Design a protein around this nucleic acid. Structure first.
Lengths: 1013, 969
DNA sequence: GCATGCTCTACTGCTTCGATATCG
DNA sequence: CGATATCG
DNA sequence: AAGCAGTAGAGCATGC
């Protein structure tokens, strides 16, 4: 009797109406229907709806998330509307069918988890149970139907509150709900199910001291009923009980394995509880109990897929612990039993089988054939590039007929990895080593029934640039021959390609299609190629490439590459689709994920009679080709680069932002990755996607300045390039690379910071906001221009570190001016090696210069990017470990086994040249995954940098000064003051953000990285 | 305006200066009553009902709190005169104030003193209680005070002067009419009082019998002798006395004015005919004498009253000579020779023959079996009168258009009892019926229902005879449809006649002595297909490039057939969808097959799709569809066909085929919804400037979401929803002016918006879940929203220096433009659109004018694709501008101050991707004319002085033409 | 050619006032 | 002269 | 009876 009297006296006058009815009207209608004036309530709710529309109308179109917070309330508004209309009209007097229909449309129409926060959840569920209680009191099976509706909505609210990190509300609701689940049985077992699942999710967030106590709490609540006379009735109740109890025993035996004995020191009765179920004779006991419960679980829709998968992961981490039994049989058994069904996590769990077959060949390989025989073939499509290189490996015959099923059904995608694998495939002497020759010949025959794909690859090949291949040949011979001519057949096997492409003007006319400029350059290679065909065929000269040097000097003079047409490549200029020749079906499709239907696939129809050449370090070319489905598609071509590892890291991006769309707090801010696409047609030739009106970052920052700001920045003696290089030469005495080794003995920590500020002072700070006001001209849109750019840039600068990438200078960042997103490209170094194998090691994890700082004025740069980075890492380290195993089988996959990597560094502008001699070893595919697992499992990021710097630059002259630069000073940097291991997320990202901006680190770094701007 | 006058009425119910604001309050009530009739809009009609039903201002308490005053008498009278016209200005939404106005009229009978104020309260009172029919509310009209209080108002009142003494007898017969089940135990003394009152009022010695208590007592006698009708079965004493009462009440030769009592006696003997049955033998001669006298008194309502009393007496005479056929030979002989003498053929103009017609048609009945040969010359003589009297094609001087349904009912009633028809005059009879049903809209109410009963009577008559005659009814409706559809009265009074004949046959069957509506609906659908067969609707081009095909031929072959085709489709819309219950079973396949067989031959004729919409809507109104399979798969092949046919059309056909497409059953067509989703995409885009397609699109999205399985549609919500953001952003004046003096009331009796869609969109968007709604705003965030949110250049050129006398500041006269062009493209407002166009023309001239002494080719490309779509847009003024402007600039850009500056090739590519585009069809035609002008003045100037490396030359655009001719697009 | 709508108007009638027969 | 009708 | 107002009913051009 407190609020209704207040409102019944306050409802007078004008000033006690023009706020109180302008604002609410809806809870006003609610308390009015509590006092039962439905027509007054009808007026107030219609005013509520009209106020919703009027409040909607004045908002803008691009102010996001306020539209969403307004829009979510309309479910509640029309729920009150349906209730008042249902209780007014009385055809529902005693006929129960409107109650049945309303129960059905209530239990169908649900607010979803992971996008609706708990306040709106509370609003709609409180309104719904309140209206149901109103029907319960008004109109005096059916009430038990009402009670089941109430509890089902409540437990749904519980299981939605678990996912969105809101544990205390579910604690309070489960605490108030236990007195309800005593008239029934399944209510009680779902109560204890939700309890143990919530304690599971709490334990991952909890510390090890807290972990043991909460799991002792849930096993203490696992001493009650629901085992008697219902696990026989519902066998799935027994199954899920065994699942959860095995998960508890799993997590406690996980808990007493990280710290050796310190956890088993302080308890008395719970210490007796540990050992009643030494110090190893109960660890193995808990592991045996967990395996026994998981065995009963997999012994007893889609309620058993997870039961298989947890036992698979259990034995998998057991096997990884063993290398760092019948369990390798059991894991492949239940894993393929899972993958036969429609799964996704098992679809990402294929290289476990692909490596455990090689490691355990005697362990039931006939079972592997027999189980891989019975599988739908629309699954393996994403994992084809490993199985195509597996044919050279002995015992490649655990599956052949499903592979042939996939080829005979969908050959037009597998045609691209097969040329790459057949380029290097050498079998053995045994009879199974000739059956593999028979198999590769029969599938080379079952492929290329048309005989036009190879022709298309050739026609795309012969539009390239000849000087680039000339430099490639010169560096290849200077590498492989100038040391010692002990190499078998390599000089001829390289010279056959040099004579085929860019030889005489008629050998490409016979073995390929004559392009309209090989008659200008392969013809021009006649007189200096006569001596080439005379002596260069079998020279073994091993000393001399100055004749190659003077010819690459005088072969850049008349270099003209703009054909600007498709007379440059006369095959596709006159394509003119004729009939069924089993058409090409443009590469870049068949991602997997279900049954691919090629009737909707786009057929490559026409090409464009104009090309544009780019300005990069390889000068690529684009095409604007046109498909059968009436549109255009642009693409860029790249000749002489391997493009398989980049496809793998794009697949890694795909799986990690598959993880990002699963938990709550990152989904509610909609954080994704701009995943473009590559295709490796043959080795050293691939097609890359190109997106729409996209500017490089250095292009934007150069275009922003004035005409005189440009010349004062670049063409000046006080240029921060020239000033930095002049100061670094004067503080060294020398003039080239190696002065970055002379600087770390003879420079102090703070005077270098002042000299850094000297060049920081020159360039302005408002350049990014000047470029952002140059285009926007609207304070309504400036907010949603800045916010999306900052969000995306923080997300990519925190996902470019979990897998360690380096070499991020300004040209590797692509901003889309129409929307305001930023995406990075050009993955050079997959794990932490770009600071290892360079002369001067860059030590920052990612870019954070003064421009991202001075855009965030007047905020400190510790509020906006901080929240999204801590949400990123809290989303990362709560996984079963998919990213770990996928990175492991990526780096262990043979594609860059140090020779491809050194050839790739020669394929770019190579700062590193030679003098390796121990770097052939210390590649070490155990150390990289070990240290990535450390830097995911909690590690101070001043320790990982020291670890890889020691591993890469042991016995270097300037090493400890490098570590002392990247070590702190115990007063100026928090990283020297923070510990070295066992950290948490907020202090992790605090150490990381302080590590990023650190004016000793930005003092001495490579001048191409351009650290000032 | 409204309700402030009512608050002034509340402030002036007790304001000062008694007898000092009577004219203020009176002009207040008259001012509200003016604009309470001067609004033909139901929104304010729904407003004012809730206005007048209030308890603070208004009427219900103002009739109780403003009585004892001298300051406002005209106000008290004007409100009770205004309420009795607002009783029927609205409908019957005054039902929850039956008891409120009951205690109101108790209060104003008691407390008020005046009589000229007492009368209009009684007016609205009795008209309200007549407006109510026997139902719940009369049970709370307490007869214990309604009879007894107002009956002791008779008793405990002497010198009851005139106008309440009549009104109390009006009240007690009013409630005798409406729900007399409360009036069982108050019957005996009241009729004794009714005898004694008129006894002392008329049969006294020296008193002048004044009219009003006679009128009241006779109306009460009629309205109370009906519930307990007193025949020769109740009391054979007051039957005799009431008989002599009403007969002296219709005594002739009393020539006077104010003919209340004779018309009252006529209206009473209209009802009470069959009651005084055995006393209708006494003075039948003088009964007929006064009937023949007062039949032609030449007073306006007295004619109708006289003929109604006349036909009622003739009906009872025919009934008594029917049921008592033994002793009545003399009586039937007298009426026989009388009517044959009056039909004899001498000079009878429209009086003796007009009474001859009805009595002849009625007396066909009795003598039908005594002789059977005079019955044979019966209807032969009747045709030999009516055929010669009708159809003379006298353009000036034969308007017997008010006498017709009498003739029709008579010829039907004589057509009944015959057998073996002379059957030669039947193409005169059917011509008579089609003439009468043709000249139907120049009638009045209560003429129309008599005519409807007549035509239904004759259709019942000539359908029990034989199927040799059952095709006259088939052909007369065929002729009638092509008559009524020809004349563009336009067609809008035949519609409810066709409704009344087949629909409300069921209220005709009672008095008159099956499958009638079956037969008439079958005949109607047969006629509407046989008419639409023989029409030849084709169009022929008269003697540009037409690339549309609802194309530039505005001329069809027979233009007077298209009018009687669109009148056909509108009549079909108004009559068809009612009652698809049992009759519309078999025609679902054959009629649909016929319509598509015609429409496949010609696509571009609208209304065919409207016929298809009508038959598919009745097919969804019936169930019938749970799998003939022929017509199922026929619609399957038809829908995809029209859904790919409707692409390159224009608006007025697009709306019709969309109303077809989204009215498919389509819960039974579960497949290929990806071909229906561009139709529903275009439907809401063509909403918000046209209502009913935007209504039916939501009405069908409801059907989709509530009846289909929500898994195929579960990805198909990302492109239905996110377009919906636009939704959630006469003689009454002179018949009211000069008082409410009831002739103005007689002349009053002679004479879906967007916000409901807003409410329904919100109810839909709420009822369709939480997890689905989120895509509604997440559409692209990269389109012309952001392109209106981008600067059109890096730096701003075109600095404008406004002229002043001292200062002259500068203004960037380009910052207005992304609102200026979106305004001038479509303003949706005819006053501001022309101003936007003039401003934009001057702006374009200025931006050209600065260019003779900075680069703007980033701006020209953003400028021109609205200059084209406004040069050839819609209106005449926006065509007369921007067309010579675009010719001026295209000829300037094809010149020597031109000649290969990026601006010229920019203009060229602008008009070229003007040519190649999806559906904007007229634009491509316009820029084809532009490239023709380009081809003219480009090459018709330059001599070969530099005409060898000009990339603007026609060879380059020939290569461009080859490129456009070479695409799989 | 007719039903109807715009005026006229004189009957009717309504209130107001006042001069005379009937019974304690 | 005083309560109650009468009537133009 | 005096002052005076409503009002049915009859009459003159007009639309369909």
């Amino acid at each position: 009797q407190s609020l209704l009297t207040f409102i019944d006296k306050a409802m007078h006058g004008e000033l006690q109406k023009a706020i109180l009815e302008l604002h609410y009207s809806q809870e006003l209608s609610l308390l009015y229907l509590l006092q039962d004036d439905v027509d007054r309530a009808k007026y107030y709710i219609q005013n509520g709806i009209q106020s919703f529309m009027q409040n909607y109308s004045s908002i803008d179109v691009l102010l996001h998330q306020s539209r969403l917070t307004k829009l979510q309330s309309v479910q509640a508004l029309t729920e009150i509307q349906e209730f008042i209309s249902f209780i007014s009209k009385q055809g529902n007097l005693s006929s129960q069918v409107p109650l049945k229909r309303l129960l059905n449309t209530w239990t169908n129409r649900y607010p979803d988890a992971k996008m609706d926060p708990m306040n709106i959840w509370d609003d709609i569920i409180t309104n719904r149970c309140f209206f149901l209680s109103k029907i319960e009191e008004k109109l005096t099976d059916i009430s038990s139907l009402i009670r089941s509706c109430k509890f089902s909505m409540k437990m749904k609210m519980i299981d939605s509150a678990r996912k969105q990190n809101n544990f205390s509300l579910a604690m309070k609701l489960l605490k108030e709900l236990h007195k309800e689940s005593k008239t029934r049985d399944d209510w009680l077992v779902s109560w204890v199910q939700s309890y143990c699942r919530l304690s599971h999710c709490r334990s991952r967030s909890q510390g090890c001291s807290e972990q043991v106590l909460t799991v002792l709490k849930t096993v203490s609540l696992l001493d009650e009923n629901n085992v008697s006379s219902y696990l026989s009735k519902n066998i799935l109740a027994f199954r899920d009980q065994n699942i959860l109890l095995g998960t508890t025993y799993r997590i406690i035996a996980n808990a007493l394995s990280s710290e050796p004995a310190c956890l088993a020191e302080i308890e008395e009765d719970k210490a007796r509880r540990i050992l009643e179920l030494d110090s190893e004779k109960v660890i193995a006991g808990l592991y045996q109990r967990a395996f026994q419960h998981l065995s009963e679980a997999v012994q007893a829709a889609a309620g058993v897929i997870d039961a298989y998968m947890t036992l698979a992961d259990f034995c998998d981490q057991q096997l990884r612990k063993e290398e760092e039994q019948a369990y390798p049989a059991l894991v492949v058994e239940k894993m393929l039993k899972a993958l036969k069904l429609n799964s996704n996590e098992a679809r990402l769990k294929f290289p476990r089988l692909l490596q455990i077959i090689e490691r355990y060949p005697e362990e039931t390989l006939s079972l592997m054939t027999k189980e891989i025989s019975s599988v739908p073939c629309w699954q393996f499509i994403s994992w084809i590039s490993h199985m195509v290189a597996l044919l050279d490996k002995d015992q490649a015959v655990a599956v052949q007929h499903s592979v042939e099923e996939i080829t005979d059904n969908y050959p037009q995608a597998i045609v691209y990895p097969f040329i790459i694998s057949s380029e290097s495939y050498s079998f053995k002497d045994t009879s199974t080593g000739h059956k593999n020759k028979e198999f590769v010949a029969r599938i080379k025959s079952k492929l290329d029934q048309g005989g036009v794909i190879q022709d298309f690859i050739n026609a795309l090949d012969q539009l390239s640039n000849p000087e680039l291949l000339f430099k490639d040949w010169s560096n290849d011979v200077r590498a492989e021959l100038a040391k010692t001519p002990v190499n078998k057949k390599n000089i001829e096997k390289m010279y056959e390609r040099m004579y085929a492409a860019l030889g005489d003007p008629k050998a490409p006319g016979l073995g390929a299609f004559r392009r309209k400029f090989i008659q200008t350059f392969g013809k021009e290679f006649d007189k200096h190629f006569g001596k080439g065909g005379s002596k260069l065929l079998r020279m073994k000269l091993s000393d001399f490439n100055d004749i190659t040097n003077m010819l690459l000097l005088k072969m850049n003079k008349d270099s003209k590459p703009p054909g600007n047409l498709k007379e440059c490549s006369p095959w596709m200029s006159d394509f003119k689709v004729e009939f069924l020749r089993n058409e090409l079906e443009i590469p870049g499709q068949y991602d997997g994920r279900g049954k691919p239907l090629p009737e909707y696939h786009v057929r490559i129809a026409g090409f464009d009679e104009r090309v544009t050449v780019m300005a990069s370090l390889r000068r690529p070319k684009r095409i604007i080709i046109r498909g059968h489905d009436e549109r255009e598609h642009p693409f860029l071509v790249k000749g002489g680069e391997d493009l398989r590892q980049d496809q793998r890291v794009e697949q890694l991006f795909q799986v990690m932002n598959g993880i990002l769309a699963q938990d709550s707090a990152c989904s509610q801010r909609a954080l994704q990755l701009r995943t473009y696409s590559v295709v490796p047609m043959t080795s050293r030739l691939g097609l890359i996607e190109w997106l729409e009106n996209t500017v490089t970052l250095k292009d934007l920052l150069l275009n922003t300045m004035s005409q005189e700001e440009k010349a004062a920045y670049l063409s000046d003696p006080r240029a921060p390039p020239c000033e930095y290089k002049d100061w670094l030469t004067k503080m060294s005495g020398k003039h080239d690379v190696g002065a970055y080794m002379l600087m770390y003995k003879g420079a102090n920590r703070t005077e270098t910071v002042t000299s850094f500020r000297k060049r920081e002072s020159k360039v302005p700070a408002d350049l990014l906001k000047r470029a952002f006001v140059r285009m926007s001209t609207s304070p309504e849109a400036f907010l949603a221009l800045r916010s999306h750019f900052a969000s995306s840039h923080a997300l990519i600068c925190i996902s470019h570190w979990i897998l360690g990438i380096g070499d991020r200078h300004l040209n590797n960042f692509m901003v889309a001016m129409e929307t305001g997103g930023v995406i990075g490209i050009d993955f050079g170094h997959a794990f932490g090696s770009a600071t290892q194998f360079l002369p001067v090691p860059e030590l920052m994890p990612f870019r954070l210069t003064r421009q991202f700082i001075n855009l965030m004025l007047p905020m400190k740069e510790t509020g906006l990017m901080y929240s999204i980075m801590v949400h990123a890492l809290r989303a990362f380290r709560s996984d079963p470990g998919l990213l770990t195993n996928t990175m492991d089988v990526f780096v262990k996959e043979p594609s860059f086994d140090w020779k491809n990597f050194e050839q790739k560094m020669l394929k770019k502008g190579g700062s590193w040249i030679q003098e390796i001699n121990v770097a052939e070893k210390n590649w070490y595919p155990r150390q990289k995954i070990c240290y990535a697992k450390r830097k995911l499992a909690g590690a101070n990021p001043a320790v990982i940098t020291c670890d890889e710097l020691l591993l890469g630059h042991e016995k270097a002259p300037a090493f400890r000064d490098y570590v002392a630069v990247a070590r702190g000073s115990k007063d100026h940097n928090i990283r020297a003051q923070e510990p070295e291991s066992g950290l948490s997320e907020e202090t992790q990202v605090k150490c990381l953000m302080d590590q990023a901006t650190d004016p000793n680190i930005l003092g001495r770094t490579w001048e191409g990285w351009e650290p000032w701007m | 305006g409204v309700r402030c006058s009512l608050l002034r009425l509340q402030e002036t119910l007790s304001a000062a200066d008694r007898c000092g604001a009577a004219l203020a309050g009176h002009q207040l009530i008259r001012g509200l009553g003016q604009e309470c009739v001067l609004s033909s809009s139901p929104a304010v009609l729904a407003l004012q009902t809730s206005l007048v039903f209030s308890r603070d201002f208004g009427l219900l308490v103002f009739v109780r709190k403003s009585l004892n005053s001298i300051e406002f008498r005209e106000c008290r009278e004007e409100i009770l005169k205004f309420l009795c016209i607002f009783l029927e200005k609205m409908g019957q939404k005054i039902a929850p104030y039956s008891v409120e106005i009951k205690n109101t009229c108790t209060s104003v009978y008691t407390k008020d003193r005046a009589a000229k104020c007492k009368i209009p309260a009684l007016d609205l009172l009795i008209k309200l209680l007549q407006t109510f029919r026997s139902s719940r509310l009369m049970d709370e009209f307490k007869i214990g005070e309604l009879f007894s209080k107002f009956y002791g108002e008779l008793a405990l009142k002497k010198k009851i002067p005139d106008t309440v003494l009549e009104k109390v007898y009006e009240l007690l017969g009013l409630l005798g009419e409406v729900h007399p089940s409360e009036m069982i135990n108050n019957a005996e003394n009241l009729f004794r009082a009714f005898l004694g009152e008129l006894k002392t009022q008329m049969t006294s010695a020296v008193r002048e019998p004044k009219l009003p208590v006679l009128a009241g007592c006779l109306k009460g006698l009629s309205s109370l002798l009906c519930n307990f009708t007193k025949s020769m079965e109740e009391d054979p004493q007051t039957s005799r006395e009431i008989f002599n009462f009403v007969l002296k009440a219709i005594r002739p030769q009393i020539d006077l004015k104010r003919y209340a009592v004779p018309s009252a006696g006529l209206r009473l003997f209209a009802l009470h005919a069959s009651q005084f049955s055995t006393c209708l033998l006494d003075n039948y001669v003088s009964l007929f004498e006064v009937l023949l006298k007062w039949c032609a008194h030449t007073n306006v309502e007295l004619k109708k009253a006289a003929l109604s009393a006349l036909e009622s007496f003739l009906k009872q005479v025919s009934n008594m000579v029917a049921k008592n056929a033994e002793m009545h030979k003399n009586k039937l002989q007298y009426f026989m020779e009388q009517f044959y003498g009056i039909i004899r053929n001498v000079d009878s103009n429209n009086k003796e023959l007009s009474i001859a017609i009805r009595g002849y048609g009625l007396f066909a009945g009795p003598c039908k079996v005594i002789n059977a040969k005079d019955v044979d010359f019966m209807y032969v003589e009747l045709i030999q009168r009516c055929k010669q009297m009708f159809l003379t094609q006298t353009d000036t001087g034969d308007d017997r258009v008010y006498q017709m349904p009498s003739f029709l009912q008579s010829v039907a009633s004589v057509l009944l009892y015959l057998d073996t028809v002379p059957e030669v005059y039947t193409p005169v009879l059917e011509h008579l019926v089609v003439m009468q049903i043709d000249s139907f809209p120049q009638y009045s109410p209560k003429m129309q229902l008599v005519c409807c009963r007549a035509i239904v009577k004759v259709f019942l008559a000539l359908a029990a005879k034989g199927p040799v005659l059952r095709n006259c009814i088939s052909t007369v409706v065929h002729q009638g449809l092509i008559r009524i559809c020809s004349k563009p009265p336009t067609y809008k009074d035949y519609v409810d006649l066709f409704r009344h004949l087949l629909s409300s046959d069921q209220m005709m069957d009672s008095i008159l002595a099956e499958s009638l509506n079956h037969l008439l609906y079958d005949e109607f659908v047969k006629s509407v297909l046989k008419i639409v067969e023989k029409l030849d609707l084709t169009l022929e081009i008269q003697t540009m490039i037409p690339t549309s095909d609802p194309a530039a031929n505005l001329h069809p072959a027979k233009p007077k057939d298209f009018s009687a085709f669109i009148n056909l489709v509108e009549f079909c819309r108004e009559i068809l969808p009612e009652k698809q219950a049992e009759f519309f079973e078999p025609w679902v396949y054959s009629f649909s097959y016929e319509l598509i067989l015609q429409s496949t031959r010609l696509p571009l004729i609208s209304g065919f799709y409207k016929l298809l919409s009508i038959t598919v809507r009745n097919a969804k109104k019936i169930k019938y569809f749970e799998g003939k399979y022929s017509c199922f798969a026929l619609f399957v092949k038809f829908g995809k066909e029209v859904a790919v046919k409707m692409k390159q059309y224009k608006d007025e056909l697009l709306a019709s085929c969309l109303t077809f497409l989204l009215s498919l059953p389509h819960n039974i067509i579960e497949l290929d919804v990806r071909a229906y989703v561009p139709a529903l995409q275009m439907a809401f885009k063509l909403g918000l400037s046209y209502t009913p397609l935007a209504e039916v699109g939501l009405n069908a999205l409801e059907e989709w979401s509530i009846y289909i399985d929500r898994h195929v549609m579960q990805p198909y919500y990302k492109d239905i929803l996110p377009c919906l953001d636009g939704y959630l952003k006469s003689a009454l004046s002179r018949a009211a002016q000069k008082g409410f003096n009831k002739v103005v009331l007689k002349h009053l009796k002679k004479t879906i918006s967007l916000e409901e869609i807003r409410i329904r969109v919100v109810q839909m968007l709420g009822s369709l879940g939480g997890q689905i709604n989120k895509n509604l705003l997440t559409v692209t965030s990269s389109d012309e929203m952001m392109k209106s949110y981008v600067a059109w250049d890096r730096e701003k050129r075109l600095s404008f220096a406004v002229p002043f006398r001292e200062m002259k500041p500068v203004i960037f006269l380009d910052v207005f433009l992304p609102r200026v062009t979106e305004l001038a493209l479509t303003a949706s407002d005819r006053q501001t659109k022309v101003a936007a166009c003039e401003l934009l023309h001057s702006m374009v001239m200025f931006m050209l004018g600065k260019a003779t002494q900075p680069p703007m080719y980033q701006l020209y490309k953003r400028t021109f694709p609205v200059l084209l779509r406004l040069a050839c847009d819609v209106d005449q003024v926006t065509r007369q501008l921007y067309e010579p402007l675009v010719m001026q600039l295209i000829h300037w850009f094809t010149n020597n101050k031109k000649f290969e500056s990026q601006d010229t090739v920019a203009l060229l590519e602008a008009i070229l991707d003007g040519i190649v585009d999806p559906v904007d069809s007229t634009l491509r035609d316009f820029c084809g004319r532009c490239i023709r002008e380009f081809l003219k003045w480009s090459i018709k100037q330059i001599t070969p002085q530099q005409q060898e490396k000009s990339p603007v030359n026609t060879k380059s655009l020939f290569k461009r033409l080859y490129s456009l001719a070479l695409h799989p697009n």
